[PDB]
Design a protein around this ligand. Structure first.
Ligand SMILES: CC(C)Oc1cc(-n2nc(C(C)(C)C)oc2=O)c(Cl)cc1Cl
Length: 276
């Protein structure tokens, strides 16, 4: 790129190579996953919690066959849980890729093991959502995950933007970010010094500032257009919003888990569930 220091260029290269090595953008190795079956104030809140993300599922076979799943309506029973095993398997697959991402980055490997764990626990969900945005089709409201597709169900478009996670995906897609800007967002999220349990606050804070400076300079050197004025500040605002979404989603997941267990072992580990 233009105008960056040698170190800033090395930093982007390290992140881009980690992304390349650990982001299966065709989802070719996502296999053996579960699928929905064929054919008291807690519950009220868990009902509201589950209806926030309503998707149909399409699976396109290599042979040309297509399976399509349309979810039920909420009618007061366990049917609101039908996609949870599947989504648990997808989130587990994505978390593994995010853990692999972080472990390949020198700046992360050099942290104490305890801070490595605290940073992954704090950011795993946010990095997953950033990766999912790169496969989000805003015109069709669909996450295109190779041969799998997750399509938002039909109030219209303005009413979907009321769900913070969906507004986030649509707003982030509109910024038309480069791969390099997505991976710097992932690094700024990963190297957050204020996650619970971080000990090397000062080292992590210094690393995060360098990633943010690199992103700011990347944008200044490579995006002169009036449309990209304030882009760096827009991205940082989205990262702050993404952290809020993370906290809301973690509370939602724990409420659902409390009355209807579904988290895989890796999810339990990331969410602090002990098994007792
Ligand atoms: C299983 C559920 C309660 O919790 C999660 C779901 C997801 N999501 N979200 C999606 C989109 C938004 C449909 C692409 O796909 C996922 O697997 C992630 Cl990343 C992490 C967790 Cl913990």
């Amino acid at each position: 790129v233009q105008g960056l220091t040698e170190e800033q260029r090395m930093m982007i290269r390290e992140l881009m190579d980690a992304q390349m090595k650990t982001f299966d953008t065709t989802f070719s190795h996502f296999k053996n996953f579960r699928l929905p079956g064929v054919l008291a104030a807690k519950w009220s809140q868990v009902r509201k919690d589950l209806c926030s993300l309503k998707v149909s599922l399409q699976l396109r076979g290599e042979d040309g066959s297509v399976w399509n799943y349309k979810p039920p309506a909420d009618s007061g029973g366990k049917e609101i849980f039908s996609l949870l095993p599947h989504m648990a398997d997808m989130s587990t697959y994505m978390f593994k890729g995010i853990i692999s991402f972080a472990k390949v980055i020198s700046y992360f490997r050099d942290l104490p093991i305890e801070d490595q764990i605290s940073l992954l626990k704090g950011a795993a969900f946010e990095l997953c959502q950033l990766r999912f945005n790169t496969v989000f089709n805003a015109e069709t409201g669909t996450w295109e995950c190779g041969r799998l597709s997750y399509c938002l169900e039909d109030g219209g478009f303005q009413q979907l933007l009321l769900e913070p996670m969906l507004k986030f995906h649509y707003m982030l897609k509109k910024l038309q970010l480069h791969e390099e800007e997505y991976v710097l967002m992932q690094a700024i999220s990963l190297f957050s010094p204020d996650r619970p349990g971080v000990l090397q606050h000062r080292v992590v804070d210094q690393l995060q500032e360098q990633f943010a400076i690199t992103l700011k300079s990347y944008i200044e050197c490579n995006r002169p257009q009036p449309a990209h004025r304030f882009l760096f500040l827009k991205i940082m605002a989205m990262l702050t919003e993404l952290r809020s979404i993370n906290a809301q989603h973690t509370q939602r997941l724990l409420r659902i888990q409390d009355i209807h267990p579904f988290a895989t072992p890796l999810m339990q580990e990331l969410f602090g569930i002990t098994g007792s």
